Scaffold this active site. Structure first.
Site, PDB file in Angstrom:
ATOM      1  N   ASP A   1       0.892  -1.153   0.000  1.00 48.38           N
ATOM      2  CA  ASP A   1       0.000   0.000   0.000  1.00 48.38           C
ATOM      3  C   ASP A   1       0.933   1.206   0.000  1.00 48.38           C
ATOM      4  O   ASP A   1       1.555   1.529   1.019  1.00 48.38           O
ATOM      5  CB  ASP A   1      -0.946  -0.021   1.239  1.00 48.38           C
ATOM      6  CG  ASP A   1      -1.934   1.143   1.257  1.00 48.38           C
ATOM      7  OD1 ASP A   1      -1.738   2.137   0.514  1.00 48.38           O
ATOM      8  OD2 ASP A   1      -2.932   1.071   2.010  1.00 48.38           O
TER       9      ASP A   1
ATOM     10  N   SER B   1       0.379  12.459 -15.507  1.00 45.61           N
ATOM     11  CA  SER B   1      -0.851  12.532 -16.319  1.00 45.61           C
ATOM     12  C   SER B   1      -0.828  13.756 -17.222  1.00 45.61           C
ATOM     13  O   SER B   1      -0.113  14.725 -16.939  1.00 45.61           O
ATOM     14  CB  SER B   1      -2.066  12.648 -15.364  1.00 45.61           C
ATOM     15  OG  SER B   1      -3.294  12.801 -16.017  1.00 45.61           O
TER      16      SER B   1
ATOM     17  N   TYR C   1      -7.737  15.682  -8.478  1.00 40.44           N
ATOM     18  CA  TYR C   1      -6.850  14.780  -9.244  1.00 40.44           C
ATOM     19  C   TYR C   1      -5.731  15.561  -9.958  1.00 40.44           C
ATOM     20  O   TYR C   1      -4.567  15.174  -9.867  1.00 40.44           O
ATOM     21  CB  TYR C   1      -7.648  13.979 -10.272  1.00 40.44           C
ATOM     22  CG  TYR C   1      -6.832  13.047 -11.152  1.00 40.44           C
ATOM     23  CD1 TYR C   1      -6.467  11.774 -10.694  1.00 40.44           C
ATOM     24  CD2 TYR C   1      -6.491  13.412 -12.471  1.00 40.44           C
ATOM     25  CE1 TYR C   1      -5.735  10.901 -11.493  1.00 40.44           C
ATOM     26  CE2 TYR C   1      -5.763  12.557 -13.291  1.00 40.44           C
ATOM     27  CZ  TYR C   1      -5.380  11.309 -12.798  1.00 40.44           C
ATOM     28  OH  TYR C   1      -4.687  10.446 -13.601  1.00 40.44           O
TER      29      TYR C   1
ATOM     30  N   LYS D   1      -1.537  15.415  -9.419  1.00 32.09           N
ATOM     31  CA  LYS D   1      -0.673  15.018 -10.522  1.00 32.09           C
ATOM     32  C   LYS D   1       0.334  16.129 -10.860  1.00 32.09           C
ATOM     33  O   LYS D   1       1.487  15.822 -11.203  1.00 32.09           O
ATOM     34  CB  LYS D   1      -1.503  14.619 -11.762  1.00 32.09           C
ATOM     35  CG  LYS D   1      -2.261  13.265 -11.622  1.00 32.09           C
ATOM     36  CD  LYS D   1      -1.257  12.111 -11.425  1.00 32.09           C
ATOM     37  CE  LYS D   1      -1.936  10.771 -11.689  1.00 32.09           C
ATOM     38  NZ  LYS D   1      -1.007   9.656 -11.430  1.00 32.09           N
TER      39      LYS D   1
HETATM   40  N1  LIG Z   1      -6.432   5.590 -17.818  1.00 27.94           N
HETATM   41  C1  LIG Z   1      -6.082   6.841 -18.151  1.00 27.94           C
HETATM   42  O1  LIG Z   1      -6.756   7.451 -18.988  1.00 27.94           O
HETATM   43  C2  LIG Z   1      -4.923   7.566 -17.458  1.00 27.94           C
HETATM   44  C3  LIG Z   1      -4.530   8.837 -17.912  1.00 27.94           C
HETATM   45  C4  LIG Z   1      -3.508   9.561 -17.274  1.00 27.94           C
HETATM   46  C5  LIG Z   1      -2.879   8.980 -16.179  1.00 27.94           C
HETATM   47  N2  LIG Z   1      -3.254   7.762 -15.731  1.00 27.94           N
HETATM   48  C6  LIG Z   1      -2.483   7.268 -14.580  1.00 27.94           C
HETATM   49  O2  LIG Z   1      -1.816   6.060 -14.931  1.00 27.94           O
HETATM   50  C7  LIG Z   1      -1.666   5.218 -13.778  1.00 27.94           C
HETATM   51  C8  LIG Z   1      -2.347   3.860 -14.031  1.00 27.94           C
HETATM   52  O3  LIG Z   1      -3.741   4.033 -14.365  1.00 27.94           O
HETATM   53  P1  LIG Z   1      -4.662   2.858 -14.991  1.00 27.94           P
HETATM   54  O4  LIG Z   1      -5.676   3.527 -15.883  1.00 27.94           O
HETATM   55  O5  LIG Z   1      -3.732   1.781 -15.488  1.00 27.94           O
HETATM   56  O6  LIG Z   1      -5.489   2.531 -13.627  1.00 27.94           O
HETATM   57  P2  LIG Z   1      -6.006   1.168 -12.912  1.00 27.94           P
HETATM   58  O7  LIG Z   1      -7.091   1.602 -11.958  1.00 27.94           O
HETATM   59  O8  LIG Z   1      -6.293   0.141 -13.970  1.00 27.94           O
HETATM   60  O9  LIG Z   1      -4.726   0.619 -12.107  1.00 27.94           O
HETATM   61  C9  LIG Z   1      -4.104   1.253 -10.975  1.00 27.94           C
HETATM   62  C10 LIG Z   1      -3.107   0.244 -10.352  1.00 27.94           C
HETATM   63  O10 LIG Z   1      -2.540   0.845  -9.155  1.00 27.94           O
HETATM   64  C11 LIG Z   1      -2.855   0.027  -8.032  1.00 27.94           C
HETATM   65  N3  LIG Z   1      -3.077   0.781  -6.758  1.00 27.94           N
HETATM   66  C12 LIG Z   1      -4.082   1.615  -6.439  1.00 27.94           C
HETATM   67  N4  LIG Z   1      -3.875   2.044  -5.171  1.00 27.94           N
HETATM   68  C13 LIG Z   1      -2.741   1.454  -4.726  1.00 27.94           C
HETATM   69  C14 LIG Z   1      -2.066   1.525  -3.525  1.00 27.94           C
HETATM   70  N5  LIG Z   1      -2.589   2.318  -2.530  1.00 27.94           N
HETATM   71  N6  LIG Z   1      -0.921   0.796  -3.395  1.00 27.94           N
HETATM   72  C15 LIG Z   1      -0.418   0.034  -4.394  1.00 27.94           C
HETATM   73  N7  LIG Z   1      -1.091  -0.073  -5.551  1.00 27.94           N
HETATM   74  C16 LIG Z   1      -2.239   0.656  -5.728  1.00 27.94           C
HETATM   75  C17 LIG Z   1      -4.056  -0.843  -8.441  1.00 27.94           C
HETATM   76  O11 LIG Z   1      -4.126  -2.049  -7.664  1.00 27.94           O
HETATM   77  C18 LIG Z   1      -3.807  -1.064  -9.935  1.00 27.94           C
HETATM   78  O12 LIG Z   1      -2.978  -2.243 -10.177  1.00 27.94           O
HETATM   79  C19 LIG Z   1      -2.277   5.990 -12.594  1.00 27.94           C
HETATM   80  O13 LIG Z   1      -1.181   6.649 -11.921  1.00 27.94           O
HETATM   81  C20 LIG Z   1      -3.240   6.967 -13.276  1.00 27.94           C
HETATM   82  O14 LIG Z   1      -3.507   8.156 -12.504  1.00 27.94           O
HETATM   83  C21 LIG Z   1      -4.242   7.045 -16.331  1.00 27.94           C
END
Ligand SMILES: NC(=O)c1ccc[n+]([C@@H]2O[C@H](COP(=O)([O-])OP(=O)(O)OC[C@H]3O[C@@H](n4cnc5c(N)ncnc54)[C@H](O)[C@@H]3O)[C@@H](O)[C@H]2O)c1
Ligand SMILES: NC(=O)c1ccc[n+]([C@@H]2O[C@H](COP(=O)([O-])OP(=O)(O)OC[C@H]3O[C@@H](n4cnc5c(N)ncnc54)[C@H](O)[C@@H]3O)[C@@H](O)[C@H]2O)c1
Ligand SMILES: NC(=O)c1ccc[n+]([C@@H]2O[C@H](COP(=O)([O-])OP(=O)(O)OC[C@H]3O[C@@H](n4cnc5c(N)ncnc54)[C@H](O)[C@@H]3O)[C@@H](O)[C@H]2O)c1
Ligand SMILES: NC(=O)c1ccc[n+]([C@@H]2O[C@H](COP(=O)([O-])OP(=O)(O)OC[C@H]3O[C@@H](n4cnc5c(N)ncnc54)[C@H](O)[C@@H]3O)[C@@H](O)[C@H]2O)c1
Lengths: 258, 258, 258, 258
Positions: free
Chosen positions: C61, C141, C154, C158
């Site tokens: 975590d 992001s 958010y 970021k």
């Molecule tokens: N999907 C998009 O459009 C997008 C765009 C910009 C940035 N992001 C960023 O990219 C990253 C991944 O996003 P995603 O879309 O793959 O999301 P997702 O929700 O599919 O995955 C997030 C991962 O982080 C883990 N996680 C969450 N809280 C945690 C904690 N407290 N400790 C350890 N692990 C934890 C989850 O278990 C999961 O494996 C994030 O940092 C997100 O903010 C995503």
């Protein structure tokens, strides 16, 4: 007080209409005496006729060193001094990037970039020779912060103005001469009237569908006025901005944030 | 006038000293009536005592929602209205990145980022309920534009203020409410005087050598004063900035250009 | 090759699914042995099992220092070394700015900003202790570059990742350690699927109309994949990026240009 | 691998020496066949002799449309194809801003801005006529991001490259053509050797004091090599960068962070 321009002597290039005319009226209201240097001397004269503190109208073509040298000396002689330059003259054309001609590339660079270089360089020589704490404000564009399709050459020339502004600011700062630019959004002038027609033609839209799209892109929810830009130029000219130099100040109603 | 604040009702958080005190005084000089909300209410009342248009001092801890909510309501009641918020309260500690404690991470985020969040959010709720064309100015930092060594946690929290400002500005724009921030450079207050002696120790330098370095890194050639920032805050509060929202305005003497 | 990661030992936080899972698979393909630290260890174990070069799954975590410390040591001990950290774990919620709760503010900042701080700080302590040419890539992001409505909290978290990245990069550069971040656009993962629903309700649109709008805002004309981000992370990890530190590399298909 | 350039046909302007020759070598190592177009066709022949995949040397003056059109057609005919342009030719002079001549203003803009415009525009015409998923990488500068004293005109011309790059990227993205630029810091080539002597004279310093100052401004703590830039250009040319367009990628060793 601190926003006051009383006693100061200003030159505005491209001051006959649009943004430049609004800049001339705003400087004058804040206490400045204004010379307008422009392609269109009769329109410049009409603006001056409405100023509180008088002023002066001179012919210039900012593309040509010898014209800028003569117009600025003439203006300085008439004003009895020189404290502030607003280098505002500019042009655009609109074309797909693959179709931009050398003539329109040169037209955009020689007014927008070279025009600012010449007026700024000559202003600084006069400030240095008179021991004046001079101030410069250049009119750049939203297109100096974000490259715009159909305006790829115009964008390049406005990025150039901003780069120039930054480098000159660094050289002038130890002389206590400040240099900033403003980057306006969708300002309702004759330039906008032209560009909405050009964009409408290139995109198969109506001109007013194009102007409606500008507003919908603007967080503050209205088309921009020349006066929105002019009051910011007054701030940048004033002692309220004494610790500010080399900035590109956005005045776009939330379109661009830096 | 378009630079004046005559009749406006303003709240300044962190207004008891340094930058915030200079802000309260500048707002008042421009015509505003000012309420100061601060952890140190005795220092707050002292600033208020010297103001021209009256004013009000209230206790607040900006890290706590219940406190901000009670202070804001008391200030608005006392003012008889609410047009402007300057969210200025802020702190720093200096430390090598590898040694930053969770305690000082939280200290920086809770005052700088959360404190701006709470005061901005509750202010906007008041503006919306009254259909007020409200204005916010947040005090960010040069460290919201460029990450600073020995201030990695401080930099992160100030970047957060700037990110909050832009996003909130996008939501509030259609409601006729503006939200900007100011990014000051090297300012001579007790935060600097603290910082410089501690910085010297950590860098293995003398405190006068560190101070001398700040000067040589500044193109305009001097240490920044709290008034250099406060005058820019007045412009941003005023109708001269009516078409500007979501900006981070550098007031650094040319150190940073955007 | 200069893009080869053969023999190198990596930790990916948040590597169980979506972008993080893609990152772990791409590092492995490039020759690294990869440990995944995630809140969902069952999913992490499934990803690790399919990797070519071995690897290790650990429960973490990232919001809690004791958790990060213990999981990082366990991963390093299993790998027999430690060269590379990709700190990817992140979360979001969507809410109008005036409705954001303290709980969801804390939810976003503790995972996104604090989680990156803890993972990076502990990684640097390991690198320095063993004289390692260490590398960090953080997942920030698009909303670290431009404030996003409905994502104001958010966005601030970021922006904080990006600020941290720059400041830490300045401290670590004299010690042969690099620190960069990636700024993804509209990536088709579970986060997107949730968000298009929430956004549709908040905006009074259909979920697929919201997705269509993301596409129309993207110059390259398609929704983004986790693999689009992962391959840029490989680059930033590699010796081809040896003269690059403190950046926010946009990977958005032309939505943001810096 | 996703970093592989096997089978691709590349043209490099300004590839006879310095950064351009490093680019040519690195693209060829990655699997590309390379044509070098340069003012010095004998030096281009020298570089081709060391390439694995063969290649071609052709004379061009990038300031002249007719020359660019002819060289590019000759190169494309020789290669049997055309997938990638790296527009790298550039020049500089150094001068206090108040002394900049119109001749050296023109020299800088004609090579640096117009040279990139012409090669880019002609390349897009060829890609479009062949339905090619073409890629462009322009060599900009640190001075496309920050105005540099003594190089005010050079800065303006390089800001112009960056704006051109953004706008062209926006037009080309719907046609699946990518356009990025790189922004190098203090690179050890003949341009650096020239600049440290000029700079030392204009500032009253030794050339090695000037050099030492560049190094002390670099967080990575060393002077840059042409290969530090070339390996990044290989990435931007490759399918790893498939979701990236309109960017100005800093390769400066931490001097500038975007
Ligand atoms: N999907 C998009 O459009 C997008 C765009 C910009 C940035 N992001 C960023 O990219 C990253 C991944 O996003 P995603 O879309 O793959 O999301 P997702 O929700 O599919 O995955 C997030 C991962 O982080 C883990 N996680 C969450 N809280 C945690 C904690 N407290 N400790 C350890 N692990 C934890 C989850 O278990 C999961 O494996 C994030 O940092 C997100 O903010 C995503
Ligand atoms: N209207 C917009 O949306 C907008 C947006 C961003 C920037 N700008 C910039 O603001 C400035 C003013 O534009 P405007 O919209 O008021 O346009 P306008 O066409 O209404 O005014 C242009 C003025 O400049 C003068 N001028 C043109 N070429 C000249 C030359 N060679 N020498 C001297 N004077 C010359 C004209 O005579 C005219 O008075 C320009 O620099 C323009 O690029 C306009
Ligand atoms: N001085 C600098 O060098 C500098 C540079 C960049 C940014 N800043 C920023 O400018 C702002 C003011 O800085 P300063 O140098 O004037 O600092 P200061 O310490 O002199 O004054 C800060 C004020 O904030 C108040 N405050 C602190 N915590 C509070 C809380 N929990 N609740 C309510 N009030 C609280 C203090 O009582 C004080 O009145 C801060 O946001 C700071 O981070 C300062
Ligand atoms: N050296 C640095 O520190 C540095 C920093 C930032 C940007 N740059 C940029 O990198 C690029 C190359 O720089 P370099 O240091 O290798 O310089 P260089 O002087 O070593 O080489 C420049 C090359 O371009 C060619 N060239 C010049 N004018 C030409 C013309 N009109 N037509 C065709 N070819 C022409 C030359 O013949 C030469 O091969 C330039 O765009 C320059 O502005 C260099």
């Amino acid at each position: 007080g601190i926003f006051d321009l009383s006693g100061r002597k200003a030159i505005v290039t491209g001051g006959s209409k649009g943004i430049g005319a609004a800049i001339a009226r705003a400087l004058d209201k804040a206490g400045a005496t204004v010379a307008i240097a422009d392609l269109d001397v009769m329109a410049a004269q009409a603006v001056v006729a409405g100023l509180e503190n008088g002023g002066f109208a001179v012919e210039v073509d900012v593309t040509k060193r010898a014209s800028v040298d003569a117009a600025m000396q003439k203006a300085i002689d008439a004003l009895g001094g020189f404290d502030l330059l607003c280098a505002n003259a500019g042009v655009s054309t609109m074309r797909p990037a693959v179709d931009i001609t050398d003539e329109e590339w040169d037209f955009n660079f020689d007014v927008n970039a070279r025009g600012v270089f010449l007026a700024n360089q000559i202003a600084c020589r006069h400030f240095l020779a008179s021991n004046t704490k001079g101030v410069i404000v250049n009119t750049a564009s939203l297109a100096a912060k974000v490259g715009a399709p159909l305006l790829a050459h115009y964008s390049a020339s406005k990025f150039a103005v901003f780069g120039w502004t930054q480098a000159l600011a660094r050289e002038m700062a130890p002389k206590n001469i400040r240099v900033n630019c403003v980057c306006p959004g969708f300002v309702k002038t004759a330039m906008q009237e032209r560009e909405i027609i050009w964009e409408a033609e290139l995109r198969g839209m109506t001109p007013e569908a194009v102007r409606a799209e500008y507003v919908s892109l603007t967080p503050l929810g209205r088309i921009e006025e020349p006066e929105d830009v002019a009051d910011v130029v007054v701030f940048l000219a004033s002692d309220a901005a004494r610790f500010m130099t080399g900035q590109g100040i956005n005045v776009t109603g939330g379109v661009r944030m830096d």
